[PDB]
Design a protein around this ligand. Structure first.
Ligand SMILES: CCCCCCCCCCCCCCCCCC(=O)OC[C@H](COP(=O)([O-])OCC(O)COP(=O)([O-])OC[C@@H](COC(=O)CCCCCCCCCCCCCCCCC)OC(=O)CCCCCCCCCCCCCCCCC)OC(=O)CCCCCCCCCCCCCCCCC
Ligand SMILES: CCCCCCCCCCCCCCCCCC(=O)OC[C@H](COP(=O)([O-])OCC(O)COP(=O)([O-])OC[C@@H](COC(=O)CCCCCCCCCCCCCCCCC)OC(=O)CCCCCCCCCCCCCCCCC)OC(=O)CCCCCCCCCCCCCCCCC
Ligand SMILES: CCCCCCCCCCCCCCCCCC(=O)OC[C@H](COP(=O)(O)OCCN)OC(=O)CCCCCCCCCCCCC
Ligand code: HEC
Ligand code: HEM
Ligand code: HEM
Ligand code: HEM
Ligand SMILES: COc1c(O)c(C)c(C/C=C(\C)CC/C=C(\C)CC/C=C(/C)CC/C=C(\C)CC/C=C(\C)CCC=C(C)C)c(O)c1OC
Ligand SMILES: COc1c(O)c(C)c(C/C=C(\C)CC/C=C(\C)CC/C=C(/C)CC/C=C(\C)CC/C=C(\C)CCC=C(C)C)c(O)c1OC
Ligand SMILES: COc1c(O)c(C)c(C/C=C(\C)CC/C=C(\C)CC/C=C(\C)CC/C=C(\C)CC/C=C(\C)CCC=C(C)C)c(O)c1OC
Ligand SMILES: CCCCCCCCCCCCCCC(=O)O[C@H](COC(=O)CCCCCCCCCCCC)COP(=O)(O)O
Ligand SMILES: CCCCCCCCCCCCCCCCCC(=O)O[C@H](COC(=O)CCCCCC)COP(=O)(O)OCCN
Ligand code: FES
Lengths: 92, 53, 245, 383, 143, 125, 165, 92, 51
């Protein structure tokens, strides 16, 4: 067949990573162990852990654009209100 | 030479291909159209309408 | 007897690869349609504007389409009203519904001839030989059913269409004699135009395409041979290597 | 390496049409494949631009094709190039299906390439048949009734399939409106089967007329068979241009220009010239169920052909009698399509039985026994 | 040549090209009536006018209208007013012969339109468009 | 597909029978030159298909000399065929040079592969 | 990067495919969504007025427009399906990435029986939320004005596109 | 990449044919030779050669089915002729 | 069958207003079932002061 280019992945046998030595793996057949073994204590304690870490990365970025839209919505409500047409004519 | 002016550069070789094909569109169209009307003189609409005089 | 008599090949002026329609015959054929075969046949697929610049002049066609009437959009209170025809409208047939056609013609349905030339085997030769192929009496041995006329070219023999073409039933605008053979040559020309209004342009675009493609086809053979020249004359020799190795 | 071989998208083009090694001695019969690829593009491109002006309702189906021919700019070029390219598509395909049978192209290791061709052969018959009923001509209505009512011979199930296929009790609006939407789909399936067809052609390559190994002398596809294919492209587009501009309605039938009528039948219901011969195989059997089995078998008999041929030589080139009976079978098919043009009358019925018998016996008796003596004449003639 | 044929087929067909011009009568259009005709798939607000509102159109200053154009340029024969119906802001249909200047009043965003078709009171960007129309005797072909 | 040993046991019997070897062999020899492969320089055994494991085995046991010459006749036939001509009359294959050089290798390879399939289905009593 | 650029091409063709299929219904919102979007190319100087007239097939949105919008809408998904094939061809040379952003060639597991059955988890959850929007609230995401037949004379109160555009 | 099957073709470098040795090739550039050099004497003498070889393979196979269709066509013409209805009724 | 033959005759009886077809009104006016009900019972005896 025709030759091909140079990539960053191989296949089973020549995957292309570094040579490894001195690392051992153990596993057990799933017919011999019980799944669902720790679903509780993971739905409570594990989820709370992850939440407490990544929640100020989403809240403050959502805490800025909520007060920015609200002070524009409650400002647009006064500009088109009967008490805020005089400010409307100076911005229209 | 004639080669040095036209066929040496592929930029100007294809330019005169397009330039010659530009002229051929209109010259060939008029050449075929005139013979076709000449071979069928006395039958076309402009000859019947001209007969009404 | 039941296939219908084969009609011969006549000398039509538009046969051949370079001939156009005789546009004087399209103008005359339209006149003998309007007064002879307009009563019982339709032409539903012909707009009025296609006649401008082919058979009649623009002021001539804007007046022919105004003798008829078309249904207009309703008035201010939804009542229907009529309008005169314009150049965007089509030629109206003689009958409103398919039932009213069969009533006037003894139950027979007269076809729409906007495509008759390409829809009856026998091309232009079958329409011409139809209207002039009527014997004065049926051949000995056959007694026709009442109300039907004999015509050998018709497959099966017996037909329901009578004779409509006589002599001097129409007067032309250019003094041509109005013989039965003359008109039958003209309607087939006008009807072939109706089925193929692209006739002339198709045959001149073809001449352009054939000349371009036939010289492209020849130029390609030279280029094919020029590029294949190194393999056509390639020569092989064979000298057996020694069996020492 | 070069960019045409390094890029992910340009390396597929490189190995199929540029650097592909071809036998150095294939003649003009091997140009037929690229002509079918050219014609597949013609049907699709001239169909997408013509599908912008077609209505699939039973009310507007016929009227819209006239609007294409009279109102669309160059609309007559679209419809003659598409109606005549369908007929030219089958003539090149028969010459592709016959060159394969002559040079023994069906033999191993190319049996899958042979079976994928038969699948392609059927889908094209359906695609042409489906697009034929789209016009809703008088011939297309009754060509639809006869072909679709053919499955009423399968016992105990036929009456429901026919009613399911029609979408009702006969050929009416539900039939045409679903025939067109299918007609737009199947060419995209053929285009996908051609991709699978060229995938099985690439593992072993093309064959050569000598029927021997071709790995000794190869030349690249580009600049040799790219410019030799250009010779037949211009000749194919010239004969097609003659049938489109100078005689557009020669191959078709004039009865298709009548609007379809459910009350009055035509004088003679005949299929197009490419389905004409199988129409005689169907009509030779004096039974309804047995006709369908016999009609469809003629396509399926080609499948056993890699097994019946008992010869140790591919092709008919160096065989006097195997080359001899081939042309009778060629002509018998040419004769087979001749009776289907004639009515069911004496003595065309008797011709219709013997001719279709010799058609089937070529695969099942003559090709296996002549191929057998030929192995013996070859053996004692040299010994 | 091949590309031109395929692309050309996409271009307008003979019947659509034919519907391009509509003529309207010089007597049938009444005085206090608004003809709203669908011409080329677009609305057109025709109004056969009175000889009194011509001074009313050019009455206001050019500061009350952001596109400066008088009545005589927006309509040639002042006995008519033929206006393109697509409003310059969004494209709404102003109410017919109801408003404050004798012309039109858009109810969508309050753009007042005069008898000449300009804006008077409103945030609309331009005066309203006038189509092509030419008198030929008893008719005038808009478009 | 009709093997080769099958059609060879047909041969050696017809050869030995005086009535048969007089009736058909004088008819077979015209079938060879009418086929006309000799004129392009082809020995018969170069015509058999080789895309199966039986012929691929015999093509490997073939000696170097008969494999080099076999390469040249196929190349010459490919070259001559594309020119739509034939070889000169003085280079054609005669009657005596067309010998069975690929016969024994095909036969010794099928009888060793017939044995394999007859041993994979032994029903021991 | 090629896997990234092929995605942007796929992104555009899907916007057109959804926009084209939106005008097929010929609702009041689809007529005016067609006018506004197609009249957008009238800003290209000296050429825009001809392209717009060429795209409409006439002088506005009428029969020539819808009849060619549908035939295009049936074609483009077959082009997306062909671009997805080219999209997975550029994904196969280097493979997927991982959330750590580091090399993934040290620990690999086969696609079958691991990510075939993990994909089955989201397939059933996707077909369950879709089943709620189809059987229990079908018209929540759409706009009610699309149920009016398209009218060339009267504009809607507010021409708004779908939530994704 | 994943392993593939066994085929009967290779590529440029390993095409898969037998080893060859002792065969030499000569060629000349097409810029230096005249094409169309022998088109005559090939359109006359070469074509006649090929025709005389393969023309009884096509004629006799076409010479059998032409007389078979004609004696059926001119027999069907008599069976449906006024003089051949009496034979028609015995075959109908 | 509806009450009027053509769109012009509908506008004549109802002062120029075009009364819509209600085979799809529920999914075509924002306000769903709540807007049709509150329409026919939401009429004050007099308009609010100022209008
Ligand atoms: C409150 C959140 C509670 C979960 C939690 O631990 O909070 C932190 C947790 C973040 O944990 P992390 O380990 O820091 O990051 C998650 C990782 O992305 C790792 O992602 P993952 O493997 O956990 O899966 C993420 C997500 C995967 O969710 C999806 O991708 C949604 C699939 C929807 C399919 C159908 C879509 C149909 C169209 C749209 C409707 O599924 C979950 O979050 C499952 C949590 C049990 O929050 C979430 O992930 C909330 C996701 C909600 C959806
Ligand atoms: C009288 C025939 C005169 C020619 C001649 O030498 O007679 C014997 C000659 C046989 O010579 P051969 O060397 O024994 O066998 C020819 C080989 O197949 C070798 O084939 P080839 O390379 O000679 O090409 C065969 C054919 C190739 O012709 C085609 O494949 C036709 C291509 C048509 C393309 C467009 C098709 C459109 C749809 C159908 C319309 O073209 C020719 O025969 C050219 C002859 C100059 O007869 C023909 O080949 C007649 C073919 C007529 C077509
Ligand atoms: C139909 C085409 C079917 C495949 C081609 C075929 O059957 O051609 C056979 C014959 C000549 O083919 P050959 O292979 O014999 O030519 C080389 C001779 N040395 O071709 C002919 O005899 C001419 C066939 C013309 C049709
Ligand atoms: C007197 C009425 C009448 C006139 C006038 C008339 N026809 Fe007919 N024509 C008929 C009828 C009725 C039929 C149907 C007969 C049937 O098919 O048996 C018919 C059938 C035909 C057919 C169909 C024949 C076919 O084989 O099916 C053609 C073609 C035709 N007419 C052509 C013409 C032409 C051409 C003209 C004049 C230019 C003409 N007709 C004038 C009454 C007329
Ligand atoms: C291999 C592919 C195709 C074949 C063989 C094919 C064949 C045919 C044939 C035989 C007809 C009838 C022609 C006639 O007698 O008038 C037809 C009609 C038609 N085909 Fe196709 N077709 C193909 C692909 C397509 C595609 C892809 C489309 C659309 C995208 C298409 C659209 C049409 C239309 C609209 C008609 C009816 C128009 C007309 O013929 O007047 N076809 N086709
Ligand atoms: C659109 C339809 C088709 C296309 C585009 C197509 C294309 C090709 C191409 C390019 C080749 C290789 C070049 C050649 O051998 O000439 C080929 C080979 C072949 N095709 Fe097709 N084909 C099509 C349909 C079919 C059909 C319908 C059959 C059989 C019924 C078939 C059977 C074959 C066979 C046997 C070969 C091998 C020929 C050889 O190697 O000598 N094909 N095809
Ligand atoms: C029908 C449309 C699409 C399909 C079926 C599709 C399918 C896929 C699949 C199966 C993968 C590998 C699995 C995965 O990464 O989750 C993938 C990867 C990717 N796709 Fe798409 N895709 C589509 C559209 C797009 C679009 C529109 C974009 C960008 C605008 C895009 C950008 C990507 C990228 C960047 C990746 C690599 C992700 C990674 O390896 O981490 N794709 N796509
Ligand atoms: C002319 O005889 C026919 C025929 O009448 C029909 C209906 C079909 C089948 C055609 C269809 C109605 C659609 C089915 C086609 C497919 C290949 C299915 C593809 C999609 C799933 C044929 O293939 C066919 O030729 C044998
Ligand atoms: C919503 O805005 C639009 C849009 O209005 C149009 C017309 C198109 C283009 C759509 C067409 C009318 C067809 C052209 C589409 C192709 C990709 C061509 C494919 C075939 C050749 C868009 O891609 C698009 O999104 C940016
Ligand atoms: C073995 O030797 C070979 C060989 O290997 C190959 C590959 C070929 C070459 C043959 C082929 C590859 C044929 C391939 C055929 C196809 C796959 C059919 C192609 C199908 C399509 C392109 C699909 C349809 C898609 C379109 C064309 C869409 C076009 C877009 C349109 C019309 C939209 C236009 C609208 C606007 C808005 C402008 C040979 O000829 C050959 O022998 C010489
Ligand atoms: C699938 C549909 C087609 C089937 C395949 C048939 C092959 C024909 C393709 C034509 C390409 C030939 C030119 C190659 C090239 O680029 O050579 C280039 C330059 O050659 C030229 O001068 C080009 C000549 C122009 C002719 C092209 C006309 C095209 C006709 C339409 C064909 C398809 C519809 C490479 O030249 P080289 O030989 O030096 O490498
Ligand atoms: C299937 C056949 C397709 C043939 C046409 C595509 C050829 C593309 C060649 C350019 C290329 O690969 O450049 C790509 C970038 O392409 C894109 O951004 C979008 C390509 C979309 C193409 C849609 C048709 C760059 O390729 P890159 O530089 O990574 O080279 C890889 C091997 N060295
Ligand atoms: S449409 Fe003119 S202001 Fe809203």
């Amino acid at each position: 067949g025709p030759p091909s280019g140079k990539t960053y992945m191989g296949w089973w046998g020549h995957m292309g990573g570094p040579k490894q030595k001195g690392i051992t793996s153990y596993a057990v057949s799933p017919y011999a162990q019980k799944p669902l073994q720790g679903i509780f204590h993971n739905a409570v304690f594990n989820s709370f852990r992850r939440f407490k870490s990544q929640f100020l990365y989403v809240l403050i970025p959502a805490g800025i654009y909520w007060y920015w839209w609200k002070n524009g919505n409650e400002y647009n409500e006064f500009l088109y209100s009967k008490a805020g047409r005089e400010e409307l004519e100076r911005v229209n | 030479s004639l080669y040095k002016t036209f066929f040496k550069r592929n930029a100007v070789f294809v330019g005169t291909i397009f330039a010659g094909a530009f002229v051929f569109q209109t010259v060939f169209d008029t050449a075929i159209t005139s013979w076709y009307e000449n071979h069928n003189k006395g039958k076309l609409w402009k000859d019947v309408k001209a007969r009404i005089a | 007897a039941e296939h219908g008599l084969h009609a011969p090949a006549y000398a039509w002026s538009h046969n051949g690869p370079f001939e156009t329609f005789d546009h004087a015959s399209i103008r005359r054929g339209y006149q003998v349609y309007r007064e002879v075969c307009a009563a019982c046949h339709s032409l539903d697929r012909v707009a009025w504007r296609t006649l401008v610049g082919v058979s009649h002049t623009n002021e001539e066609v804007r007046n022919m389409a105004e003798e008829f009437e078309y249904d207009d959009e309703p008035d201010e209170q939804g009542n229907p009203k009529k309008r005169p025809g314009k150049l965007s409208d089509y030629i109206p047939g003689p009958y409103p519904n398919e039932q009213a056609a069969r009533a006037a013609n003894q139950g027979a349905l007269p076809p729409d001839l906007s495509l008759i030339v390409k829809a009856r085997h026998g091309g232009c030769d079958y329409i011409f030989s139809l209207l002039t192929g009527y014997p004065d009496e049926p051949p000995a041995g056959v007694a026709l059913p009442p109300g039907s006329n004999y015509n050998p070219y018709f497959p099966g023999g017996s037909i329901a269409m009578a004779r409509v073409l006589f002599d001097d039933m129409v007067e032309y605008e250019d003094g041509t004699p109005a013989t039965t053979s003359q008109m039958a040559k003209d309607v087939t020309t006008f009807l072939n135009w109706c089925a193929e209004p692209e006739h002339d342009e198709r045959k001149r675009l073809g001449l352009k395409t054939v000349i371009i493609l036939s010289s492209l086809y020849l130029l390609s053979i030279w280029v094919k041979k020029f590029k294949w020249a190194g393999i056509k004359t390639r020569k092989f020799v064979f000298n057996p290597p020694k069996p020492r190795k | 390496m070069a960019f045409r071989k390094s890029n992910v998208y340009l390396s597929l083009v490189n190995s199929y049409i540029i650097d592909s090694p071809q036998p150095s001695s294939i003649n003009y019969w091997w140009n037929m494949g690229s002509l079918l690829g050219l014609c597949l593009v013609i049907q699709i491109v001239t169909g997408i631009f013509m599908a912008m002006h077609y209505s699939s309702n039973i009310e507007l189906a016929f009227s819209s094709v006239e609007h294409i021919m009279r109102d669309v700019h160059n609309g007559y070029i679209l419809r003659y190039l598409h109606a005549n390219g369908a007929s030219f598509f089958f003539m090149v395909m028969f010459m592709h299906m016959a060159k394969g049978l002559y040079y023994g192209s069906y033999r191993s290791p190319r049996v899958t390439l042979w079976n994928v061709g038969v699948i392609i052969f059927i889908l094209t018959i359906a695609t042409a048949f489906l697009g034929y009923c789209c016009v809703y001509g008088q011939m297309s209505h009754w060509g639809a009734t006869v072909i679709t009512n053919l499955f009423s011979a399968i016992p105990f199930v036929g009456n429901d399939i026919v009613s399911w296929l029609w979408g009702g009790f006969s050929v009416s609006n539900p039939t045409i409106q679903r025939f067109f939407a299918l007609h737009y789909l199947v060419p995209f399936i053929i285009a996908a089967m051609v991709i699978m067809h060229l995938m099985a052609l690439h593992i072993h390559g093309s064959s050569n007329p000598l029927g021997i190994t071709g790995n000794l002398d190869r030349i690249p596809m580009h600049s040799y068979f790219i410019f030799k294919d250009l010779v037949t492209v211009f000749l194919f587009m010239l004969i097609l241009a003659l049938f489109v501009f100078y005689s557009p309605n020669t191959l078709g039938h004039p009865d298709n220009y009548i609007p379809g009528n459910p009350l009055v039948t035509p004088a003679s219901i005949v299929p197009e010239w490419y389905l004409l011969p199988f129409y005689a195989i169907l009509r030779s059997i004096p039974d309804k169920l047995l006709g369908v089995i016999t009609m469809f078998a003629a396509i399926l008999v080609l499948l056993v052909l890699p097994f019946t041929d008992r010869s140790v030589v591919r092709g008919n080139t160096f065989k006097v009698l195997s080359k001899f009976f081939f042309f009778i079978f060629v002509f018998n098919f040419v004769l087979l399509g001749q009776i289907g043009a004639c009515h069911v009358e004496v003595p065309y019925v008797l011709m219709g039985q013997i001719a279709t018998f010799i058609y089937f016996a070529y695969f099942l008796i003559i090709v296996p026994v002549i191929s057998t003596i030929e192995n013996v004449l070859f053996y004692i003639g040299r010994v | 040549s091949t590309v031109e044929t395929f692309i050309s087929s996409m271009t307008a067909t003979a019947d659509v090209l034919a519907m391009a011009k509509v003529e309207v009568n010089l007597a049938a259009i009444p005085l206090g009536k608004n003809v709203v005709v669908k011409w080329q798939g677009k609305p057109v607000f025709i109004r056969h006018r009175t000889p009194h509102e011509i001074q009313e159109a050019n009455s206001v200053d050019m500061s009350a209208l952001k596109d400066p154009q008088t009545d005589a340029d927006r309509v040639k024969d002042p006995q008519w007013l033929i206006m393109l119906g697509i409003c310059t802001h969004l494209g709404c249909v102003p109410i017919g012969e109801a408003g404050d200047f004798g012309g039109w009043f858009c109810p969508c965003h309050g753009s007042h339109y005069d008898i000449s078709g300009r804006i008077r009171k409103g945030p609309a960007p331009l005066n309203l468009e006038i189509p092509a129309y030419e008198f030929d005797g008893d008719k005038v072909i808009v478009g | 597909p009709q093997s080769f040993t099958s059609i060879a046991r047909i041969g050696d019997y017809i050869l030995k029978s005086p009535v048969l070897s007089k009736l058909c062999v004088p008819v077979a020899n015209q079938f060879i030159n009418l086929a006309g492969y000799k004129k392009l320089g082809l020995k018969f055994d170069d015509l058999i298909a080789e895309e199966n494991p039986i012929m691929q085995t015999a093509l490997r046991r073939l000696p170097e000399d008969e494999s080099y010459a076999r390469a040249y006749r196929i190349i010459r036939a490919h070259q001559t065929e594309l020119t739509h001509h034939l070889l000169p009359r003085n280079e054609w294959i005669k009657a005596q040079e067309d010998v069975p050089y690929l016969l024994p290798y095909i036969l010794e390879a099928e009888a060793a592969a017939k044995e394999k399939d007859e041993l994979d289905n032994i029903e021991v009593s």
